[PDB]
From a paper:
Surprisingly, the [name] mutant, which was initially identified in several human cancers (Lawrence et al., 2014), could significantly increase the phosphorylation level of [name] substrate S6K1 compared to the wild-type (WT) [name], and thus is regarded as a constitutively active mutant (Grabiner et al., 2014; Heard et al., 2014). To investigate the molecular basis for the constitutive activation of [name] by the [name] mutant, we determined the crystal structures of Y35NGppNHp and Y35NGDP at 2.0 Å and 2.1 Å resolution, respectively. On the other hand, the overall structure of Y35NGDP is more similar to that of WTGppNHp (RMSD of 0.79 Å for 162 Cα atoms) than that of WTGDP (RMSD of 0.92 Å for 162 Cα atoms) or Y35AGDP (RMSD of 0.97 Å for 167 Cα atoms). In the Y35NGDP structure, no Mg2+ could be identified at the active site, although Mg2+ is present in the protein storage buffer and the crystallization solution. In contrast, the switch I region and the binding mode of GDP exhibit notable difference in Y35NGDP and WTGDP (RMSD of 2.2 Å for 9 Cα atoms of the switch I region using the least-squares fitting method). Similarly, in Y35AGDP, the switch I region adopts a similar conformation as that in WTGDP, suggesting that mutation Y35A does not affect the conformation of switch I. However, in Y35NGDP, the side chain of Asn35 flips away from the nucleotide and points toward the solvent (about 180° rotation from that of Asn35 in Y35NGppNHp). Meanwhile, the side chain of Thr38 extends slightly closer toward the nucleotide, and thus occupies in part the position of Mg2+ and forms a hydrogen bond with the β-phosphate of GDP. In the Y35NGDP structure, the switch I region assumes a similar conformation as WTGppNHp and Y35NGppNHp and, in particular, the side chain of Thr38 is oriented toward the nucleotide to avoid steric conflict with mTOR, and hence both Pro37 and Ile39 are in proper positions to make tight interactions with mTOR. In other words, Y35NGDP mimics WTGppNHP in binding to mTOR and thus is capable to activate [name] in a similar way as WTGppNHp.
Mammalian target of rapamycin complex 1 ([name]) serves as a central regulator of cell growth and proliferation by integrating signals from growth factors, nutrients, energy status, and cellular stress. A small GTPase, called [name] ([name]), is a positive regulator of [name]. Like other small GTPases, the function of [name] is dictated by its guanine nucleotide binding states: it is active in the GTP-bound form and inactive in the GDP-bound form. The [name] mutant assumes a very similar overall structure as the WT [name] with a typical small GTPase protein fold composed of a six-stranded β-sheet surrounded by four α-helices.
Numbering used by the authors: 3 to 170
Write the structure that this text describes.
């Protein structure tokens, strides 16, 4: 029988939070200039034979000054933290967000996924794979690079966070 899990997707503006989520949920790459507002999707996924009902919370992009909420610091089963490999600023910001997140969750190990998105834009990449891998390692977080244009990598992101959560 199925299990329910709630995942929050966090990160700086225009890193691809919406696009990655929509690619996973709907199978389509959408290019939109609407600002990302908090949006919750529901999605079925099977991971190692276990069926999951996912609630995916896309959050508005935040920056270093962003006060971290409290609503995103309880009842979440796992967090996907997204930066863009084409944006140094998004990478600086994801460190600040992670720090504020750990401060809010208290004395518990919470599944965290670091995601470097937009890996298809080879001519604009300014962050190496190794920089993100090393960051995730210092965090004990899973790490993947992704492209919202590539369905397999979006699926792999959301499978991975469920893999991490099930380890407890
Ligand atoms: N080439 C490419 N463009 C992307 C990718 N992800 C997002 N984008 C584009 O980047 C812009 C911001 O993406 P969006 O999903 O709205 O970012 P959000 O603010 O984090 O939700 C939009 O133009 C997207 O079409 C990606 O993986 N590859």
């Amino acid at each position: 029988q199925s299990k329910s899990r709630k995942i929050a997707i966090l990160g700086y503006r225009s890193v691809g939070k919406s696009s990655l989520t929509i690619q996973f949920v709907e199978g389509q790459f959408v290019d939109s200039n609407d600002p990302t507002i908090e949006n919750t999707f529901t999605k079925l996924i099977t991971v190692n034979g276990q069926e999951y009902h996912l609630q995916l919370v896309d959050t508005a992009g935040q920056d270093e000054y962003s006060i971290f909420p409290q609503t995103y610091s309880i009842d979440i089963n796992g967090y996907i933290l997204v930066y863009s490999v084409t944006s140094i600023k998004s990478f600086e910001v994801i460190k600040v967000i992670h720090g504020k997140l750990l401060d809010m969750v208290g004395k518990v190990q919470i599944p965290i996924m670091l995601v470097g998105n937009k890996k298809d834009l080879h001519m604009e990449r300014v962050i190496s794979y190794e920089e993100g891998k090393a960051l995730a390692e210092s965090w004990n977080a899973a790490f993947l690079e992704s492209s919202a244009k590539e369905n397999q990598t979006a699926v792999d992101v959301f499978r991975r966070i469920i893999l991490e959560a099930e380890k407890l």
